Structure formats: C-alpha cells, structure tokens
Amino acid sequence: MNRVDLSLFIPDSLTAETGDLKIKTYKVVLIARAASIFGVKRIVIYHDDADGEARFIRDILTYMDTPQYLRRKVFPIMRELKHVGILPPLRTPHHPTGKPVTGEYRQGLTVKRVKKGTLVDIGADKLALCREKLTVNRIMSFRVVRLGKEILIEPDEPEDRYWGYEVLDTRRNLAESLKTVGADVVVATSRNASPITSILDEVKTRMRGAREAAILFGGPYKGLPEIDADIWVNTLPGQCTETVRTEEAVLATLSVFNMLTQ
Amino acid sequence: MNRVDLSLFIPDSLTAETGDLKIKTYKVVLIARAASIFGVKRIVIYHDDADGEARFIRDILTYMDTPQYLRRKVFPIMRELKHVGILPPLRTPHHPTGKPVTGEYRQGLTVKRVKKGTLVDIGADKLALCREKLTVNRIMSFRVVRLGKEILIEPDEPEDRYWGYEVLDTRRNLAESLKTVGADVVVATSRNASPITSILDEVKTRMRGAREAAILFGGPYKGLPEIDADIWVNTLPGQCTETVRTEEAVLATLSVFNMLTQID
C-alpha cells in the first residue's frame, strides 16, 4: 500500500447481533481504526438483506475521522452516540492537537461568511479564508497561510500524507453501491472462496493494477450477493472458530493486502 | 496454518490506557478471539511498564478459553469481571454446547477422588474416569467412551482439531519470560524492523521449518526491549496511524503469518 486506493464495503448489519450500545459503538470504531491503519481512502456502508443500522455505523465512522476540535460542533452528540466517549483515539495527520502553526495543513469547518471572505473553525480561534464564497457548514482542508489574532488560511489538500477516509452511506444494496464507486478491481472475500494462500501471486498482480480496489465483506453468517467481482478469496484460510466477525475480517484482510501491495 | 505451534507474548500493560472496565474486558476478549481464530497454542503475559493488570488479563483470557459449562464453578464472583457478559462468543472444538456423545472430546473439571476413581464434570451431567491420582479441582481433557447414567471418559485431548490455548502468566519480563517458555523460533515485531515484505522468503522458510514459534508483541507507545530473537520484523509496513494497539497488532500479525505457514 503506497498508492492503490482502497475502498472497503461493509454491510449495515454488522452491529445487529451486538446488544450493548457501548460495545456496538466500539465495534464500529475498530473498523475506523482498521481503515485508518492501512490508509483506506473510503468506507462504503451498504444495505444488507435484513434491517440495518447504517445511520449509526456512518455516524460513528465519520465522528472518528473528524478532527477532535470539530466533532462537538458537527455532532449533536445525542443519545444514539452517547458512548462515543469510549472510542479509541485516532492519531492521524488530519487529527493534529494543539495550536496551529504556519504552513500546517488542517481540516476546518466553514462557519460564517463575512465581507473579508469565509470564517472557519480550525481548532484555534476562528480563522479567515479569503476565497469569498466558501459555502458554510463544510469540512474542508486548508493550509495555514499566516498567524495573528485572526489566522489566515487557503483551501489546500496534502498529497504527501494520509488524510483519512470518506464514508459513503449509500442506502442501496451491494450491487448498486458497488456500481456507484466502480473500481478497476473488485475483491470479494468469502469463507467459501479459494484460500488466498493458493491464488496469492494472482492477487498480488491484479492489485498492482493499482487504480482503486474495492474489498467486499459480508457477515459471518450470510455470504455476499450474486455480485460481479474480479476476484473471490478467503483471506483467512483455516480459521479455527466457526465464525469470523466483520470488524475482524476487515483488519485481517487489510493486513494481508497491505503486504501484497509492497 | 498448522504443524507450527504458536505462542504469542503480550505485555501486561495492554489495557492500561482505558478507564472503562467494559471496554477493558472487551479488549482482552479481542485477543482471545484473534488467538483462537488462528489456532494459537498459548498466550504468555509478560511484565513491562510501571503497574499492570497481568491478573485481569489472565482472568479474561482464561474465562474465555474455559468451556461455559465450567466458568460458573471455576471462577469466583470477581468484581473485576462483572462485564464478562459482553465478551464475544468463541465457537471452538473444545466449546461444545450439545450434550455429551460417544467418541467426542470434552475438557473436564476434576471434582472428587472417588472410591472407584475420580468424578469429572464434563458436558451436561456428572460422570467419571477411572484414574485416581487425578488431582482434584483441575481441568484436563478426556474423550467420551460410553454414555448412559455413569458415562465413562478416558483422559485424552485431540491433535487433529484446534483445542484452545493455555495462558501463561510469567510474572517475569520479556527476556526472563522467553527463558521460562522456549520455542525453537522467536519472531520479534517492530515498526523499526525490516518489513516482512523484504525478508519474506526468509521468514517463510524459518516459519515452515517450525516446531514451536513465539511471536513477540510490545506496546504501541514503546515497542520491544533489545531481546535476542531469531527474526526481527515489521508485519505492518507503512501504517498511517501513529500507533497500532496490541490487540490490533496481534490479529493483523497472526493473519500475515497465517498466510505464510500454510501447506500444499
């Protein structure tokens, strides 16, 4: 993983079996951490046959990707997300702590638009962006141009670092959600597909196609739908437990792939 | 993976940064799952930072390895483990839930040395084995030979299926803990080390020519002391996060090695 943009697809039913809300929110945070550890660019929540909790799953994932200084302004932190407090930290480049320094890249929430341009929250004191028509209430990437009583920034995105993931809450099933992002390589993982250990060099090569790959995960119970995937593998051959939970399979699989993509 | 017995070494400081007890027990449970998923033979808990919760870590992991038809009698009401209820299930060969049948294997708790021999607590009801020396109040494996009222079982644990892990609470440190429990191959993980992706064939060769391997996991905040290992390696090249929790590292690493020690 040095380029190949990865997109993970997860069923909105991943938290269905876990009753405890604290545990359920923590479950979803493990996915945020797994995605971030391996530099995943996007997480896709799709509608699984049963009923789902897409809203909750999306909410936790986004809360986690959002810098600490902005979640309290972006998240009404009501009942649903009450345990959001026991989520593990996420130490990524877009999650800086402490006052902003010159030349530093930060994500900011456009707040109020003034005559000078747009006022934005970057985690210090309201900063001003000169690019007049920045639409308010958005989270954008900025570069700190200059400091002062009113910091100055310009919209800008780093390319030399990990910048988090975008979470797509398509309320559509897998087939269509896949149809949306449509990547050049679609890897479907299944306990019943050939062990990765056998088709290893094939996967190594395809993934090197290197555009954007979509990794698909189903539940421990129901396998994926009759979908179109460039490859089908069991990335966890010889499991010794009757089941492998999705948060687990996500991490286990991202790790195996991380090594195939150099 | 098989014919390559795995032991992993984890620090007694892994639950140190979480105040929440429920999450804290759940985190140890994740280690219990990663271990079982990959058929780990044992979990060695070593000493490292200031304080620690080697005992708490030892209790949760054991609680989970221990069949549910025993926990109630093997574990006293311990305030520390009040959230054992939310630990994720572990469906393993040694965790049968269906009543005892002929030729099936079951782990049993020894209860009392009886006139004929010894009564062990197997699956459902109460049964017995012949052997007397069988120390009481200790768990061991047996295989049901004959059912009925006085079901008889003979001590024996399979070697064809996974049979859980044993928890080793060496109250010694990393180095002193390697001495206590030996393996012919020590693999040390670290971000500072050479990436698995480089010394790959090498690692694979050492791993397959295995007997018993020990995978060492340090913390995310410190790493590992300069112990002598047969292989130093970063199984997670290019992490985008500043830290990788031990529980994360354990699972991620196990699946990378799991991919290497497979067989034709």
In order, the DSSP letters of B17-72 are T---HHHHHHHHHHHHHHHHHTT--EEEEEB-SSS--HHHHHHHHHHHHS-HHHHH
Q: Give the distance from residue A220's alpha carbon to the nearest chain B alpha carbon, in angstroms.
A: 12
Identify which of A200, A188, A186, A195 has the alpha carbon closest to the alpha carbon of residue A261. A200
How many A-B residue pairs are in contact by the CB < 8 A criterion? 118
CB neighbour list of residue B233: distance below 8 Å, 6 or more residues apart? B187, B188, B189, B190, B193, B194, B195, B196, B199, B203
Closest chain B CA to residue A259: B197
Give the Å distances, CA to CA, from A246 to A28, A221, B15: 10, 10, 23
To one decimal place, what's the resolution in Å? Answer: 2.3
What does the CA dihedral B197, B202, B204, B206 come to, rounded to 10 degrees?
-140
Contact at CB, A236 and B251, closer than 8 angstroms: no
Identify which of B4, B7, B35, B9 has the alpha carbon closest to the alpha carbon of residue B175. B9
Closest chain B CA to residue A89: B243
Q: Which helix (H) or strand (E) holds A257?
A: helix A246-260
Structure tokens at B218: 């340090």
Given a contact cutoff of 8 angstroms between Cβ atoms, the answer to whether B57 and B44 are in contact is no
Q: Give the distance from residue A256's alpha carbon to the nearest chain B alpha carbon, in angstroms.
A: 5
Pairing of strands B42-46, A166-173: unpaired
CA B196 to CA B45: how far, in whole Å? 24
Residue intervals in chain B for CATH 2.40.50.140? 99-157
Q: With both helix axes pointing from N to C terminus, report the angle between A21-37 and A54-65 in degrees, rounded to the nearest 10.
A: 50
Beta-bridge partner residues of B143: B105, B154
Cβ atoms within 10 Å, residue B247: 24
Given a contact cutoff of 8 angstroms between Cβ atoms, the answer to whether B230 and B185 are in contact is yes
Query: Hey, what amino acid is at A246?
Result: T
CA B29 to CA B128: how far, in whole Å? 32
Is B139 in a helix, a strand, or coil?
strand
Q: Could you please report the per-residue DSSP string of B181-203?
A: S--SEEEEE-SSSPBTTTSHHHH
CB neighbour list of residue A49: distance below 8 Å, 6 or more residues apart? A13, A222
How would you class B5 by CB atoms within 10 Å of its CB: exposed for 0-12, middle for 13-18, buried for 19 or more?
A: middle
Contact at CB, A241 and B90, closer than 8 angstroms: yes
Is A152 in a helix, a strand, or coil?
strand
Give the Å distances, CA to CA, from A8 to A34, A209, A217, B183: 10, 17, 8, 38
Whether A243 and chain B come into contact, CB under 8 Å, resolves to yes
Whether A244 and chain B come into contact, CB under 8 Å, resolves to yes
CA A204 to CA A155: how far, in whole Å? 37
Structure tokens at A109: 């929430």
Q: With both helix axes pointing from N to C terminus, report the angle between A246-260 and A200-207 in degrees, rounded to the nearest 10.
A: 80
CA A124 to CA B84: how far, in whole Å? 42
Q: Which helix (H) or strand (E) holds A57?
A: helix A54-65
Give the Å distances, CA to CA, from B137 to B65, B108, B110, B131, B151: 17, 10, 5, 14, 19
Beta-bridge partner residues of A216: A9, A188
Show the CA angle centred on residue B242, arms to residues B238 and B248, nearest 5°.
Answer: 75
CA A1 to CA A260: how far, in whole Å? 8
Given a contact cutoff of 8 angstroms between Cβ atoms, the answer to whether A181 and A168 are in contact is yes
Query: Where do we find the tokens 């790790």?
Result: A255
Among B86, B90, B242, beta carbon nearest to A20: B86
Query: Which experiment gave this structure?
Result: X-ray
Given a contact cutoff of 8 angstroms between Cβ atoms, the answer to whether A127 and A108 are in contact is yes
How much is the CA Rg of chain B, to the nearest whole Å? 20
Pairing of strands B139-146, B105-113: antiparallel
Q: Which CATH number fits domain B99-157: 3.40.50.1000, 3.90.420.10, 3.30.2270.10, 2.40.50.140?
A: 2.40.50.140
Given a contact cutoff of 8 angstroms between Cβ atoms, the answer to whether A145 and A154 are in contact is yes
Task: Provide the chain A residues 190-209 that lie in CB contact (below 8 A) with chain B.
Answer: 195-197, 200
Among B38, B235, B244, beta carbon nearest to A37: B244
Contact at CB, B196 and A259, closer than 8 angstroms: yes
Contact at CB, A197 and B259, closer than 8 angstroms: yes
Residue intervals in chain A for CATH 3.40.1280.10? 1-94+165-261
Q: Could you please report the per-residue DSSP string of B103-132?
A: T-EEEEEEEEE-SSSEEEE-SSSEEEES-S
- N- to C-terminal Cα separation, chain B: 11
Given a contact cutoff of 8 angstroms between Cβ atoms, the answer to whether B6 and B253 are in contact is no
Q: Which CATH number fits domain B1-94+165-261: 3.20.20.70, 3.30.470.30, 3.40.1280.10, 3.30.70.1450?
A: 3.40.1280.10
Given a contact cutoff of 8 angstroms between Cβ atoms, the answer to whether A9 and A46 are in contact is yes
Identify which of A143, A133, A76, A144 has the alpha carbon closest to the alpha carbon of residue A110. A133
Among A90, A244, A256, beta carbon nearest to B241: A90
